[PDB]
């Protein structure tokens, strides 16, 4: 995030980090329950990648994080790689996340929910702060 | 080089009609734009959440998808519109 700010540790409990086997963070994701994570289909997640929950500082070795294995990758059948439309993938975890003060789920909206232009929302992540 | 600590940013949602002034026909119905306000999602944020507070609870409205190749803060980022994808999410969870 460019021009964002540091978050209060653990204040976005559903935010997970998707890392490859080398420990490299390549995408974010959100826990929707103990066994499922929602992410972008274009992230190209495989069962070799790891979901890291409860993390704030990726440079810290003292955080009680949860490294969860992925059982199956469910890419939305309507995903169009050419236009990047319907960019969503569900990841079913091999081992359920353990909810705590720093690990919990985000709510999902109803298909008819209305979120008006002008409404101020929030986005989070460990993406580039400067390009 | 991604930051060590988790970042956050508040930003406004745009209508797809106004977002089209920036992105043209690349904006589809299953997309929702936000930003062009001095902040921007960027490489590495992909897959992450865009949440809005509804009735006191944070709700997943978008999934970071794509945007400016230079993460310009005066251009809106594009997110996967969750309301258009939630029925698939629920069918998937119910059958697995």
């Amino acid at each position: 995030i460019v021009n964002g700010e540091e978050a209060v540790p653990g204040s976005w409990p559903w935010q997970v980090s998707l890392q490859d086997k080398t420990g490299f963070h390549f995408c974010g994701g959100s826990l929707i329950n103990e066994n499922w994570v929602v992410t972008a289909a274009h992230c190209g997640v495989t069962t070799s990648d790891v979901v890291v929950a409860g993390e704030f500082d990726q440079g810290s070795s003292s955080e009680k994080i949860q490294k969860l294995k992925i059982a199956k990758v469910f890419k939305n059948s309507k995903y169009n790689s050419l236009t990047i439309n319907n960019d969503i993938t569900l990841l079913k975890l091999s081992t359920a996340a353990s909810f705590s003060q720093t690990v919990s789920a985000v709510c999902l909206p109803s298909a008819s929910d209305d979120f008006a232009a002008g409404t101020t929302c929030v986005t989070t992540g460990w993406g580039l702060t400067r390009y | 080089n991604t930051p060590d600590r988790l970042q956050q940013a508040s930003l406004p949602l745009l209508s797809n009609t106004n977002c089209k002034k920036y992105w043209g026909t690349k904006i589809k119905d299953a997309m929702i734009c936000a930003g062009a306000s001095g902040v921007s999602s960027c490489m590495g944020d992909s897959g992450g959440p865009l949440v809005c507070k509804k009735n006191g609870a944070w709700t997943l409205v978008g999934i970071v998808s794509w945007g400016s190749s230079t993460c310009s803060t005066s251009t809106p980022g594009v997110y996967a519109r969750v309301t258009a994808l939630v029925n698939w999410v629920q069918q998937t969870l119910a059958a697995n």
């Binding site: 274009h42 990047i84 993406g127 | 992105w23 690349k26 999602s41 960027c42 490489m43 590495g44 944020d45 992909s46 970071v64 998808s65 794509w66 945007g67 400016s68 190749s69 230079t70 980022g77």
Partner: peptide, 5 residues
Amino acid sequence: TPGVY
């Protein structure tokens, strides 16, 4: 210019 995130 556009780009994936």
